[PDB]
């Protein structure tokens, strides 16, 4: 009945023994493990939110779906990344049966788990996602930007270097035709300009305004990096 969630409560209380007991009780009763509270969270969602990798493992092995969406369309992988929890992300990926967990899932905003991870500045979740097959060039509908472009706009030299190291397309363009280099160049982000150029960014690429990164260059310093 409504308003009582013994399983959700057992999870938030970090009581694995009680979760175990309840999982068995729900199963024997034929009940769904992926039942929602009023916040549209499943017990598995809450296991990730509470950072309980052992409970994550238990629920997933018991049949809880890593693709169940929360109120914002987040999968369990999205939530692990939101909560900067490499251990929960690992528990999910390792415990999920093959063919059940898709890392290309887009939440309601349109982002993949990789986009979320890049935005949190957590190198650990980003690396694990890529190691497990996340599309490094995935483009969300809202922004039209790859994770690389997101990192550049966040002015995160660490995420930029990490993505490039894992084979990110340095010449991905947004809807307007601007690349990561246009962004770094127009905003005077020197360290990022250096890295992108050295990594092979195309400085002759024209956007919708017919501008190259050189043409939007903010300062004589950026300009000089771009000329070589």
UniProtKB/Swiss-Prot annotation:
ANK repeat copies, ranges = 2-31, 39-68, 72-103, 109-138, 143-172, 176-205, 206-228
Supply the alphabetized keyword list: Activator, ANK repeat, Chromosomal rearrangement, Cytoplasm, Nucleus, Phosphoprotein, Proto-oncogene, Repeat, Transcription, Transcription regulation, Ubl conjugation
GO biological process terms, alphabetically, are:
antimicrobial humoral response; canonical NF-kappaB signal transduction; defense response to bacterium; defense response to protozoan; DNA damage response; DNA damage response, signal transduction by p53 class mediator; extracellular matrix organization; follicular dendritic cell differentiation
Localization recorded for this chain is: Nucleus; Cytoplasm; Cytoplasm, Perinuclear region
Top-level taxonomic group: Eukaryota
Q: Name one GO cellular component term.
A: cytoplasm
Name of this protein: B-cell lymphoma 3 protein
Citing just one GO molecular function, the answer is:
transcription coactivator activity
Q: How does it assemble?
A: Component of a complex consisting of the NF-kappa-B p52-p52 homodimer and BCL3. Component of a complex consisting of the NF-kappa-B p50-p50 homodimer and BCL3. Interacts with N4BP2, COPS5 and PIR. Interacts with CYLD.
Regarding how it is modified after translation, the entry says:
Polyubiquitinated. Ubiquitination via 'Lys-63'-linked ubiquitin chains is required for nuclear accumulation. Deubiquitinated by CYLD, which acts on 'Lys-63'-linked ubiquitin chains. Deubiquitination by CYLD prevents nuclear accumulation.
Which residue stretches, if any, does this entry annotate as coiled coil? none
Purpose: Contributes to the regulation of transcriptional activation of NF-kappa-B target genes. In the cytoplasm, inhibits the nuclear translocation of the NF-kappa-B p50 subunit. In the nucleus, acts as transcriptional activator that promotes transcription of NF-kappa-B target genes. Contributes to the regulation of cell proliferation.
Identify the disorder associated with this protein.
A chromosomal aberration involving BCL3 may be a cause of B-cell chronic lymphocytic leukemia (B-CLL). Translocation t(14;19)(q32;q13.1) with immunoglobulin gene regions.
